[PDB]
Ligand binder design. Structure first.
Ligand code: HEM
Length: 154
């Protein structure tokens, strides 16, 4: 699949709002993932001791990680599909070291969409959500293809 330029601009216009405060958005997205799909937290040896939303919010180390995650995703989105170089290292680490199935990437995609819907109704109406869904679906399809090349079922 391929996004239109208009669809990319809807993606990038909401991401511009995320970048007012990437850390706060990152906290909201990973906490939403862990609340909605608690099995995902067990993949993080670094964070799986955290018991409550309040502990997650208070963790400076989690905050920092969420900034790393969202900045990596933002750099991918800014490539508008031309993200082969960015996807290589991430697909390798997530396949071989972290062992993150495609289903869990669906779950984090849901969390991203939820938080952007909540925080950004001015830039995340139906067309904008559809564009972000397409971008995240493209990202997941390309990761799944790389996982297969790397030997991971996903
Ligand atoms: C939008 C999707 C995601 C992006 C962009 C992303 C990005 C990153 C980045 C940049 C790192 C650090 C470098 C590396 O190890 O490759 C990382 C680490 C990690 N990711 Fe992801 N990630 C995503 C989704 C997930 C999901 C859904 C899980 C778990 C369910 C996961 C689990 C991990 C783990 C366990 C680490 C190592 C954390 C640590 O101990 O330092 N990732 N991720």
């Amino acid at each position: 699949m391929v996004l239109s330029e208009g669809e990319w601009q809807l993606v990038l216009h909401v991401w511009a709002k995320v970048e007012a405060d990437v850390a706060g958005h990152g906290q909201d997205i990973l906490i939403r993932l862990f609340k909605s799909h608690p099995e995902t937290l067990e993949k993080f040896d670094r964070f799986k001791h955290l018991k409550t939303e309040a502990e997650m919010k208070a963790s400076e180390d989690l905050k920092k990680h969420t900034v790393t995650v969202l900045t990596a995703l933002g750099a991918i989105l800014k490539k508008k599909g031309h993200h082969e170089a960015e996807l290589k290292p991430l697909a390798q680490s997530h396949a071989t070291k972290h062992k993150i199935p495609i289903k869990y990437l669906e779950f984090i995609s849901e969390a991203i969409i939820h938080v952007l819907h909540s925080r950004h109704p001015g830039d995340f109406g139906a067309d904008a959500q559809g564009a972000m869904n397409k971008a995240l679906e493209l990202f997941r399809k390309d990761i799944a293809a790389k996982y297969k090349e790397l030997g991971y079922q996903g």
